[PDB]
Design a protein around this nucleic acid. Structure first.
Ligand SMILES: [Mg+2]
Ligand SMILES: [Mg+2]
Ligand SMILES: [Mg+2]
Ligand SMILES: [Mg+2]
Ligand SMILES: [Mg+2]
Ligand SMILES: [Mg+2]
Ligand SMILES: [Mg+2]
Ligand SMILES: [Mg+2]
Ligand SMILES: [Mg+2]
Ligand SMILES: [Mg+2]
Ligand SMILES: [Mg+2]
Ligand SMILES: [Mg+2]
Ligand SMILES: [Mg+2]
Ligand SMILES: [Mg+2]
Ligand SMILES: [Mg+2]
Ligand SMILES: [Mg+2]
Ligand SMILES: [Mg+2]
Ligand SMILES: [Mg+2]
Ligand SMILES: [Mg+2]
Ligand SMILES: [Mg+2]
Ligand SMILES: [Mg+2]
Ligand SMILES: [Mg+2]
Ligand SMILES: [Mg+2]
Ligand SMILES: [Mg+2]
Ligand SMILES: [Mg+2]
Lengths: 132, 380, 62
RNA sequence: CCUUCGAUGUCGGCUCUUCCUAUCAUUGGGACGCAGAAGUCUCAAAGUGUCGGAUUGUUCACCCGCUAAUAGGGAACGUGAGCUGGGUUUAGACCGUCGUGAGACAGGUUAGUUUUACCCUACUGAUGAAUUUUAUUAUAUAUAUACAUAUAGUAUUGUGACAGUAAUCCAACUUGGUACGAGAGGAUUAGUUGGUUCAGACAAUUGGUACAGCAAUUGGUUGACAAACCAGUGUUGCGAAGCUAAGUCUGUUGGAUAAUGGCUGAACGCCUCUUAAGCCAGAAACCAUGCUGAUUAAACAAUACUAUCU
RNA sequence: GUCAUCUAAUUAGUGACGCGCAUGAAUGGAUUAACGAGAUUCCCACUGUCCCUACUUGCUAUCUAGCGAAACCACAGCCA
RNA sequence: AUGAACUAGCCCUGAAAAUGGAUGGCGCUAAAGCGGA
């Protein structure tokens, strides 16, 4: 699978709390790290709508709690530019729990998923309902 | 002791004496290397900045995510009225640098060229270039033979025509354009044919060419360290204010070093930028100079309501991809690359699908002024 | 040149202008200016404002 | 116990620059108990980097992470007329041990004032005259000339000594499930597409900003309508132009080398990269090219006009 | 200090344990509803404290007419 | 007229630090260096 992902505006820094968007049992997610982030003195790591993150679950069924997990961002509230020449934004921020290799722990996504996110992960595209 | 945490330096020490420039005009510091196997040709030009707009274009990159999509890009417009060639100068090489033999002028010159030699032309007798045009041509030809025999570099003196723009200025801008190409004699022959004619901009450049730009940035005055160098901002509890650098240096190098950022003048700097691509060379004899194959609406480049802060463009122009330093009306200098490039982007040729001409005052909604009256119907 | 409507005040949107908003369900909305986006996001109705094409269609003013 | 007791502000952090190499990563090499992969020892080399957090006043520690790597240090233990004031280190007060007692404790605890730059210099930007014991990399008609030439004023176009200097790292796919290997595994180079951190600009689009402007409205006051005003910007919605990032564009190639590996060839009839003479290839290092300045050279040239007078 | 709890991660907070350097009974011991500009930890709401800074108003500073001090001062003020 | 061992003069390896620097400086190799006359 190719990994190109033309740049997207980042607005979801570390310490944000977002919805969980799937049927795995959790209700929210708490971002604590972002893969691929480098070094810069006072800067916070931040993620956009195709990246994989490390998160914990603050509410949901007890066996999912008190652990570090993997997640993938599917919707975001900050606007971003599409090369066709317009701007897009959702209402809320959502993500799903996955494997370190990007395989879901649940079996269904609830709401719409972004068209850029589905181009990078084939299982998420297969399990989606409406791609926008 | 050592600093606790590392961070790269703030400014760039290569643009360092951040003082105001000597002039409006951008000066070429070095020219492209002469390839004596090409035919003689010009190397530079000059015009004025008008404004910006956007276009729609199709992509031809196999392997990219955008390989078959129409995309939007931003472009800049430069007004390019023709210049006039009025003189010849020849240099020769000495161990102290290039040196001049003589300058040779044309038989006639215009008044906007002569105004550039006067602080206040309106109260003068206007006696510049009045006795040295009656020189016999025999002396001129002897001087040209000497230039041919003893020199190694030619340049041509050219000037612009501000009367064909919406500018308030009437003095013409003067510059030298080096001529690369064949032998010295061929160079001299090439130049002499033009001593009183016009250069169109289309003679000097080609469609889909890559070009370098020289101009002077916008001026802002005195600006603080936070804005001038982008240093960190300091905590709100600080007693004498927070917009500064805390430590100027260690104790005992017992001075302030030149690398420390300080307050001072920002803007109005001289710059040279590389690799700006040409998208269209429009003319003034063409009525539909902003229409495409996919949009047959008859249009000129000027947006509805005039270019904001400039005026109307009714000469031939260049369309450049990207941005250029300077304000509106700032004179822009255009040089060829030092050596020609052969990359995948330098050779690729561009076909356009739409050029926007809606109003830039406010939020434009129509492409021509007839659509506006067609939409509303009769008014009161 | 291809163009499509504003979904709040059905003016025509030329390329390089617009703004879209995906709702709770997969509905797509497409405004052109900041004024219309702000008005729609404050939940105002186009039929209640005098200058929109919806008001003067319901008043037979065309 | 040499300097300072008619006084050199005493912990740590934050901010900012520069230097060292005893090299963690990135560049080219040599060796292995070296099949590949992953490592270990070592050479030239300081050009470019060396992070986000929980507990503690901490320096020091110790965990959670990402990363290419999260190397070690100096500059009056860099840095208080730069800040801050949590600790220590005056006067209040509590506890424990000690003391007949007043009181002590390098044992805990809580509350406790951080003053002055307009001077010199350094550094950052801004105006600006005066330069004959002065200068010259030619001029004039193949010949002559330093035993020579050079005035000033106002303008334009140029030369360029010297000083500063800039880019950096990564991933995916192809090569190719291949060379190597019994298997398990499994890459060097090269290409293509993107990205990180830096640097220089810009405002077509998106967002931010309001004492241009238009509209709405509470209390009060002009008899009412209309028109207005006060409440130090009464409050609210939209808000052009301009400025601006979180938005957009741009960021080269040559010369001569160090390590190492080689050529021809004596000393020493064989041999030998030279541990003689004579040569070759060769690194993110060096010098140019390119870029910024050039009252940094008290520096110069060509040109166009004008100087009751060379 | 050991065990549990709170976090992703706890020299901090809480609940237990006790051969307690050096705890203990009007030098008062153990509790305790209400009250406190008293000392600490965690949660919800909130935000320019921060990521990362930008734009704006009054009053200064600035240049003019007028008026007009002081501290300090061996002599002075480029470097290796 | 070839082998081996040993000995001692000049030279070389052992030989890494923080602002840019010090046989006093320039520089000096048919010495302007070291041991003599
Ligand atoms: Mg910090
Ligand atoms: Mg304070
Ligand atoms: Mg506009
Ligand atoms: Mg309408
Ligand atoms: Mg003293
Ligand atoms: Mg002192
Ligand atoms: Mg003192
Ligand atoms: Mg060692
Ligand atoms: Mg190697
Ligand atoms: Mg290596
Ligand atoms: Mg100190
Ligand atoms: Mg020390
Ligand atoms: Mg102080
Ligand atoms: Mg301190
Ligand atoms: Mg100090
Ligand atoms: Mg204190
Ligand atoms: Mg006390
Ligand atoms: Mg706006
Ligand atoms: Mg605006
Ligand atoms: Mg306890
Ligand atoms: Mg008793
Ligand atoms: Mg007692
Ligand atoms: Mg004043
Ligand atoms: Mg000194
Ligand atoms: Mg001597």
């Amino acid at each position: 699978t190719l990994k190109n992902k033309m740049r997207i505006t980042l607005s979801l820094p570390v310490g944000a709390l977002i919805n969980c968007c799937d049927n795995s049992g959790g209700k929210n997610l708490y971002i604590i790290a972002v893969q691929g982030f480098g070094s810069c003195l006072n800067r916070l790591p931040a993620a956009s709508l195709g990246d994989m993150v490390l998160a914990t679950v603050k509410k949901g069924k007890p066996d999912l709690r008190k652990k570090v997990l993997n997640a993938i961002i599917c919707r975001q509230s900050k606007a971003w530019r599409r090369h066709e020449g317009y701007y897009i934004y959702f209402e809320d921020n959502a993500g799903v729990i996955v494997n370190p290799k990007g395989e879901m722990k649940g079996s269904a996504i609830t709401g719409p998923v972004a068209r850029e996110c589905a181009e990078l992960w084939p299982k998420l595209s297969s399990a989606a309902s409406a791609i926008v | 002791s050592h600093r606790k945490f590392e961070r790269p330096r703030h400014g760039s020490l290569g643009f360092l004496p951040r003082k105001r420039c000597k002039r409006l005009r951008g000066k070429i510091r070095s020219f492209p290397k002469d390839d004596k196997e090409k035919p003689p040709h010009f190397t530079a030009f000059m015009g004025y900045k008008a404004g910006m707009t956007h276009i729609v274009r199709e992509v031809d990159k196999p392997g990219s995510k955008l390989h078959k999509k129409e995309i939007v890009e931003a472009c800049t417009i430069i007004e390019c009225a023709p210049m006039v060639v009025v003189g010849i100068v020849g240099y020769r090489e000495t161990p102290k640098g290039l040196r001049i033999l003589s300058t040779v002028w044309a038989n006639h010159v215009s008044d906007e060229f002569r105004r550039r030699y006067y602080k206040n032309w309106y109260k003068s007798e206007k006696k510049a270039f009045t006795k040295s045009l009656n020189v016999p041509e025999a002396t001129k030809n002897c001087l040209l033979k000497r230039i041919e025999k003893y020199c190694t570099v030619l340049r041509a003196i050219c000037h612009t025509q501000p009367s064909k723009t919406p500018l308030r200025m009437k003095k013409a801008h003067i510059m030298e354009v080096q001529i690369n190409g064949g032998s010295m004699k061929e160079k001299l022959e090439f130049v002499k044919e033009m001593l009183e004619k016009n250069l169109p901009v289309s003679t000097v450049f080609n469609p889909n060419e890559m070009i370098d730009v020289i101009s002077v940035t916008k001026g802002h005055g005195t600006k603080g360290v936070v804005s001038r160098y982008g240093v960190k901002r300091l905590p709100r509890k600080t007693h004498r204010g927070l917009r500064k650098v805390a430590c100027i240096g260690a104790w005992h190098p017992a001075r302030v070093q030149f690398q420390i950022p300080r307050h001072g003048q920002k803007g109005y700097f001289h710059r040279t930028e590389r690799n700006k691509k040409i998208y269209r060379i429009g003319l003034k004899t063409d009525k539909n100079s902003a229409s495409t194959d996919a949009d047959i609406t008859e249009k000129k480049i000027t947006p509805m309501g005039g270019f904001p802060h400039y005026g109307v463009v009714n000469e031939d122009f260049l369309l450049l991809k990207g941005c250029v330093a300077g304000t509106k009306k700032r004179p822009i200098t255009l040089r060829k690359n030092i050596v020609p490039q052969v990359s995948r982007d330098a050779l690729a040729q561009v076909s356009l699908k739409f050029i926007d001409t809606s109003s830039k005052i406010g939020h434009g909604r129509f492409q021509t002024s007839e659509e506006k009256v067609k939409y509303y119907g009769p008014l009161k | 040149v291809k163009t499509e409507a504003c979904s709040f005040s059905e003016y025509r949107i030329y390329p390089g202008r617009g703004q879209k908003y995906i709702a709770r369900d997969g509905k797509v909305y497409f405004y052109l200016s900041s004024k219309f986006a702000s008005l729609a996001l404050q939940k105002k109705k186009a039929a209640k404002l005098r200058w929109t094409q919806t008001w003067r269609r319901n008043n037979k003013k065309t």
